[PDB]
């Protein structure tokens, strides 16, 4: 359990601090496991609205979202699940998401649309900033060139059909460096 715990803490911390973006539904499912872990089996009479310090159970973007009902529902559903079992499930649930282990940046697409741009050792993904759904994915091995200016970042994957991919961001350089270091190994 001491070893299982580290993994759990790591996975939990990334969801909670926002490094690992997840959907509202998922975040609430995670908090349900977290509740089982920290308070044991759900007690309807005490584990009710106002009981949780929400900032300790949900990503910041979902605190003002009235998620306590869904949280306690997920908690109640764990039944008498053990702390160990609850942690393994939490860890695996995080591993099951395509957003897992992805470095995300928040950008604006063409009224502009906020969007989560993710980079990994092998690809670039466009993810809905709200539902956290993978909308599109590119393979890094197909990267041709890129342009990063103080207020934008553009990628060219050599795709004639739709053209280039350009978004508003002040982190263009940060992203370019992540990409350059990764292709140094794959290309």
């Amino acid at each position: 359990p001491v070893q299982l715990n580290l993994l759990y803490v790591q996975a939990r911390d990334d969801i909670l601090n926002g490094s690992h973006p997840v959907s509202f539904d998922k975040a609430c499912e995670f908090a349900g496991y977290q509740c089982q872990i920290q308070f044991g089996p759900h007690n309807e009479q005490k584990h009710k609205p106002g009981f949780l310090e929400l900032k300790d159970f949900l990503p910041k973007e979902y605190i003002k979202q009235k998620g306590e009902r869904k949280i306690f529902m997920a908690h109640k559903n764990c039944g008498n699940m053990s702390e160990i079992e609850a942690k393994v499930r939490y860890v695996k649930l995080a591993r099951s998401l395509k957003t897992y282990g992805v470095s995300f940046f928040l950008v604006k697409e063409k009224k502009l649309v906020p969007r989560l741009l993710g980079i990994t050792k092998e690809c670039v993904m466009r993810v809905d900033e709200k539902t956290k759904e993978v909308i599109q994915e590119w393979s890094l091995t197909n990267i041709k060139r890129w342009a990063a200016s103080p207020k934008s970042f553009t990628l060219d994957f050599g795709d004639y059909q739709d053209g280039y991919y350009s978004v508003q961001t002040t982190e263009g350089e940060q992203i370019a460096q992540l990409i350059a270091g990764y292709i140094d190994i794959i290309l």
Partner: peptide
């Protein structure tokens, strides 16, 4: 755009 080539062999070689 002031591009930075990726020097990707797929396109370069």
């Amino acid at each position: 755009h002031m591009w930075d080539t990726a020097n990707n062999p797929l396109y370069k070689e």
